Amino acid sequence: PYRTTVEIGLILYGIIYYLSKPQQKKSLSPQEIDALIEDWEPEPLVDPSATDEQSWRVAKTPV
């Protein structure tokens, strides 16, 4: 009866604990949010490094 019921409860929790999750592993402030904003460095809209070397096409276009 009750003596069997509590034993069944303990055993039932036993298998539940045995087949637990797959080894669960142990796991920001607004003051540092502005630091991330200030650390952002965007890129130029257009790259001008190779403009000079490739500019002969415009100079050779007939008008």
């Binding site: 036993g14 080894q23 142990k26």
Partner: protein, 177 residues
């Protein structure tokens, strides 16, 4: 202050230990703990059976009834395990600067991993011991209730997913963070 390193002692009925900051967690816990590393080693799982057998034989050498012997051995084993693991907080030797001054040995096992085989074994053993032991004092309901209360209250509730980093201020103002 330029460092702001203080220990808080907030008082409430239910409270939890705050999560460690970057410096305390990612940097001050790098070397082996040397306090919870011996659990997963050679001969660290059979020693509990030897302790139980030795206690049972020592109590049987007195020449008492089986009921009293088994109740006493169960209570002694559970109380000893609780005193060793769950009661004390800290480490017997300085680790870095006192990083583990808010946690017990149970929490430090396997780098605060919730479910590992050793924890499963440690949770399984008291239930099996109780199932084996109850067969001698089933007639007496008071001893059955006492054994059930001891097992559930001491050997089951602390080893749970809940009651992890859980502190109660009833027996003293505990320190968190």
């Amino acid at each position: 202050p330029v460092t702001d390193h203080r220990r808080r002692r907030a008082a409430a009925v239910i409270s939890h230990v705050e999560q460690e900051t970057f410096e305390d967690e990612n940097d001050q816990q790098m070397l082996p703990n040397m306090n919870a590393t011996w659990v997963d080693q050679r001969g660290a799982w059979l020693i509990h059976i030897v302790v139980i057998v030795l206690l049972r034989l020592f109590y049987s050498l007195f020449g008492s009834t089986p009921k009293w012997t088994w109740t006493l051995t169960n209570m002694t084993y559970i109380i000893g395990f609780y005193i060793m693991f769950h009661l004390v907080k800290g480490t017997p030797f300085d680790f870095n600067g006192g990083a583990y001054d808010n946690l017990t040995m149970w929490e430090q096992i396997n780098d605060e991993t919730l479910y590992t085989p050793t924890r499963k074994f440690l949770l399984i053993v008291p239930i099996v011991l109780f199932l084996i032991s109850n067969q001698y004092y089933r007639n007496d309901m008071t001893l059955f209730l006492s054994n059930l209360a001891v097992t559930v209250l001491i050997g089951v509730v602390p080893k749970l997913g809940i009651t992890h980093r859980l502190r109660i201020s009833i027996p003293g103002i505990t320190g968190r963070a």
